[PDB]
Design an enzyme around this catalytic site. Structure first.
Site, PDB file in Angstrom:
ATOM      1  N   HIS A 153       0.792  -1.330   0.124  1.00 40.24           N
ATOM      2  CA  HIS A 153      -0.138   0.049   0.088  1.00 40.24           C
ATOM      3  C   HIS A 153       0.810   1.290  -0.161  1.00 40.24           C
ATOM      4  O   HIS A 153       0.557   2.106  -0.808  1.00 40.24           O
ATOM      5  CB  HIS A 153      -0.870   0.072   1.224  1.00 40.24           C
ATOM      6  CG  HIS A 153      -1.637   1.292   1.524  1.00 40.24           C
ATOM      7  ND1 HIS A 153      -2.588   1.883   0.656  1.00 40.24           N
ATOM      8  CD2 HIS A 153      -1.363   2.270   2.258  1.00 40.24           C
ATOM      9  CE1 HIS A 153      -2.729   3.216   1.042  1.00 40.24           C
ATOM     10  NE2 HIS A 153      -2.220   3.344   2.034  1.00 40.24           N
ATOM     11  N   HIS A 158       0.919   5.133  -2.209  1.00 42.91           N
ATOM     12  CA  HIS A 158       1.340   6.434  -1.857  1.00 42.91           C
ATOM     13  C   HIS A 158       2.645   7.048  -2.728  1.00 42.91           C
ATOM     14  O   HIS A 158       2.345   8.078  -2.910  1.00 42.91           O
ATOM     15  CB  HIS A 158       1.769   6.597  -0.237  1.00 42.91           C
ATOM     16  CG  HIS A 158       0.412   6.605   0.636  1.00 42.91           C
ATOM     17  ND1 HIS A 158      -0.489   7.611   0.451  1.00 42.91           N
ATOM     18  CD2 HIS A 158      -0.279   5.475   1.306  1.00 42.91           C
ATOM     19  CE1 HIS A 158      -1.355   7.361   1.381  1.00 42.91           C
ATOM     20  NE2 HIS A 158      -1.194   6.140   1.914  1.00 42.91           N
ATOM     21  N   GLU A 198      -6.285   9.082   0.528  1.00 34.66           N
ATOM     22  CA  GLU A 198      -6.421   7.548   0.631  1.00 34.66           C
ATOM     23  C   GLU A 198      -7.471   7.037  -0.243  1.00 34.66           C
ATOM     24  O   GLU A 198      -7.239   5.862  -0.993  1.00 34.66           O
ATOM     25  CB  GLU A 198      -6.835   7.205   1.968  1.00 34.66           C
ATOM     26  CG  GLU A 198      -5.679   7.479   3.292  1.00 34.66           C
ATOM     27  CD  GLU A 198      -4.405   6.602   3.128  1.00 34.66           C
ATOM     28  OE1 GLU A 198      -3.493   6.994   3.968  1.00 34.66           O
ATOM     29  OE2 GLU A 198      -4.429   5.619   2.302  1.00 34.66           O
ATOM     30  N   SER A 217      -3.719   0.513  -4.215  1.00 31.35           N
ATOM     31  CA  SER A 217      -2.993  -0.823  -3.722  1.00 31.35           C
ATOM     32  C   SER A 217      -4.048  -1.821  -3.687  1.00 31.35           C
ATOM     33  O   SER A 217      -3.370  -2.964  -3.152  1.00 31.35           O
ATOM     34  CB  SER A 217      -2.389  -0.440  -2.498  1.00 31.35           C
ATOM     35  OG  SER A 217      -3.331  -0.195  -1.417  1.00 31.35           O
TER      36      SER A 217
HETATM   37  N1  LIG Z   1      -5.244   6.787   6.567  1.00 28.33           N
HETATM   38  C1  LIG Z   1      -5.940   5.570   6.778  1.00 28.33           C
HETATM   39  N2  LIG Z   1      -6.713   5.373   7.963  1.00 28.33           N
HETATM   40  C2  LIG Z   1      -7.517   4.266   7.966  1.00 28.33           C
HETATM   41  O1  LIG Z   1      -8.065   3.990   9.034  1.00 28.33           O
HETATM   42  C3  LIG Z   1      -8.778   5.095   9.572  1.00 28.33           C
HETATM   43  C4  LIG Z   1      -7.960   4.911  10.965  1.00 28.33           C
HETATM   44  C5  LIG Z   1      -7.805   6.447  11.794  1.00 28.33           C
HETATM   45  C6  LIG Z   1      -7.421   6.388  13.073  1.00 28.33           C
HETATM   46  C7  LIG Z   1      -6.857   5.290  13.530  1.00 28.33           C
HETATM   47  C8  LIG Z   1      -6.101   5.343  14.856  1.00 28.33           C
HETATM   48  C9  LIG Z   1      -5.043   4.484  15.234  1.00 28.33           C
HETATM   49  C10 LIG Z   1      -4.445   4.346  16.404  1.00 28.33           C
HETATM   50  C11 LIG Z   1      -4.814   5.558  17.389  1.00 28.33           C
HETATM   51  C12 LIG Z   1      -5.927   6.348  17.037  1.00 28.33           C
HETATM   52  F1  LIG Z   1      -6.265   7.226  17.881  1.00 28.33           F
HETATM   53  C13 LIG Z   1      -6.600   6.153  15.582  1.00 28.33           C
HETATM   54  C14 LIG Z   1      -6.867   4.026  12.818  1.00 28.33           C
HETATM   55  C15 LIG Z   1      -7.734   4.118  11.760  1.00 28.33           C
HETATM   56  C16 LIG Z   1     -10.442   4.999   9.840  1.00 28.33           C
HETATM   57  F2  LIG Z   1     -10.555   4.022  10.895  1.00 28.33           F
HETATM   58  F3  LIG Z   1     -10.807   6.091  10.366  1.00 28.33           F
HETATM   59  F4  LIG Z   1     -10.662   4.859   8.810  1.00 28.33           F
HETATM   60  C17 LIG Z   1      -7.281   3.277   7.029  1.00 28.33           C
HETATM   61  C18 LIG Z   1      -6.286   3.427   6.090  1.00 28.33           C
HETATM   62  C19 LIG Z   1      -5.906   2.288   5.006  1.00 28.33           C
HETATM   63  C20 LIG Z   1      -6.136   0.894   5.321  1.00 28.33           C
HETATM   64  C21 LIG Z   1      -5.963  -0.284   4.640  1.00 28.33           C
HETATM   65  C22 LIG Z   1      -5.493   0.342   3.352  1.00 28.33           C
HETATM   66  C23 LIG Z   1      -4.971  -1.203   2.413  1.00 28.33           C
HETATM   67  C24 LIG Z   1      -5.750  -1.083   1.212  1.00 28.33           C
HETATM   68  N3  LIG Z   1      -7.363  -1.373   1.570  1.00 28.33           N
HETATM   69  C25 LIG Z   1      -5.263  -2.297   0.298  1.00 28.33           C
HETATM   70  O2  LIG Z   1      -5.993  -3.526   0.472  1.00 28.33           O
HETATM   71  O3  LIG Z   1      -4.437  -2.026  -0.151  1.00 28.33           O
HETATM   72  C26 LIG Z   1      -5.166   1.425   3.021  1.00 28.33           C
HETATM   73  C27 LIG Z   1      -5.606   2.577   3.666  1.00 28.33           C
HETATM   74  N4  LIG Z   1      -5.763   4.654   5.961  1.00 28.33           N
HETATM   75 FE   LIG Z   2      -2.170   4.950   3.201  1.00 22.89          FE
END
Ligand SMILES: Nc1nc(O[C@H](c2ccc(-c3cccc(F)c3)cc2)C(F)(F)F)cc(-c2ccc(C[C@H](N)C(=O)O)cc2)n1
Ligand SMILES: [Fe+3]
Length: 274
Positions: A153, A158, A198, A217
């Site tokens: 990914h 990116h 994303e 990805s």
């Molecule tokens: N920037 C971002 N955020 C993601 O999740 C968000 C996320 C936001 C904050 C956290 C978080 C982690 C830790 C502490 C905290 F306070 C917050 C976790 C996930 C949310 F859940 F909001 F959608 C998920 C992804 C993501 C996840 C997976 C993939 C892979 C793609 N589906 C593939 O198959 O290639 C690509 C991007 N990217």
């Molecule tokens: Fe990403």
């Protein structure tokens, strides 16, 4: 008062750490990230035969889709990465190589990350043109989609766009706006980031193309995004920021930007309002 935020690139040291064979291997990667300190070359990894095979499937199938699916900027930078960073079906590029490539192109650099960072910490990195990248590979059982970000990914989704000046500026400006911002402001910026960087689509020469790294990805979601059996709305920060970010599944809506230039201008007007 104002929450703590990084004032220099090295300050990211202070937040970037916040089956069973697969578990030990993930621990190996997590430790590499945790032990990393700004200034270090990023540890190069000897990837396993299974890991390389998974990459190969992802690389081979996505490259069939890119010419008809990816935005022009993505397609412009992808061959440079084959030439200089070892992007091949039989080779997983190294974070150090791609970081050095980005440093010369847009001033972007990479920092290895053990897992998910808080949106605040992740966005803070972008302010200094630092992208936190995972180093591990997708579980081999599903190359087409994974609910968590892996190195495939980061590298295929990116990196080619971080190599584009207009996109790098757009990204950094999200980061800069987040620095010391309210909890509410960070969430709105993180949602805008999610639905652009994303999972964003753009209109080019009248046609829908994709620039979202999470789409670029995933063999399966990339096809789905432009199928078109998915809902698409115009990118509009005041609306887009309220949209729920989905994990574990395909998105329920994709937002369409006019250009990286336009998305940046809309974000500039929006950040003044929050
Ligand atoms: N920037 C971002 N955020 C993601 O999740 C968000 C996320 C936001 C904050 C956290 C978080 C982690 C830790 C502490 C905290 F306070 C917050 C976790 C996930 C949310 F859940 F909001 F959608 C998920 C992804 C993501 C996840 C997976 C993939 C892979 C793609 N589906 C593939 O198959 O290639 C690509 C991007 N990217
Ligand atoms: Fe990403």
């Amino acid at each position: 008062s104002v929450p703590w935020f990084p004032k220099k690139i090295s300050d990211l040291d202070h937040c970037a750490n916040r089956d069973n064979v697969y578990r030990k291997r993930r621990k190996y990667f997590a430790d590499l990230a945790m032990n990393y300190k700004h200034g270090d070359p990023i540890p190069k990894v000897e990837f396993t035969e299974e890991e390389i095979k998974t990459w190969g499937t992802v690389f081979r199938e996505l490259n069939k889709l890119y010419p008809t699916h990816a935005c022009r900027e993505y397609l412009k930078n992808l061959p440079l990465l084959s030439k200089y960073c070892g992007y091949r079906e039989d080779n997983i590029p190294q974070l150090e190589d791609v970081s050095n490539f980005l440093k010369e192109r847009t001033g972007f650099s990479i920092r290895p990350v053990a897992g998910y960072l808080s949106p605040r910490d992740f966005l803070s990195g972008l302010a200094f043109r630092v992208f936190h990248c995972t180093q591990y590979v997708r579980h081999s059982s599903d190359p087409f989609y994974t609910p968590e970000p892996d190195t495939c990914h980061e590298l295929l989704g990116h990196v080619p766009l971080l190599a584009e000046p207009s996109f790098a500026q757009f990204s950094q400006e999200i980061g800069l706006a987040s620095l010391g911002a309210s909890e509410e402001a960070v969430q709105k910026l993180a949602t805008c980031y999610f639905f652009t960087v994303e999972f964003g689509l753009c209109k080019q020469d009248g046609q829908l193309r994709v620039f979202g790294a999470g789409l670029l990805s995933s063999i399966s979601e990339l096809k789905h995004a432009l199928s078109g059996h998915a809902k698409v709305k115009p990118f509009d920060p005041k609306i887009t920021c309220k949209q729920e970010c989905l994990i574990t599944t395909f998105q329920d809506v994709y937002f369409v930007s006019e250009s990286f230039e336009d998305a940046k201008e809309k974000m500039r007007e929006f950040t003044k309002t929050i």
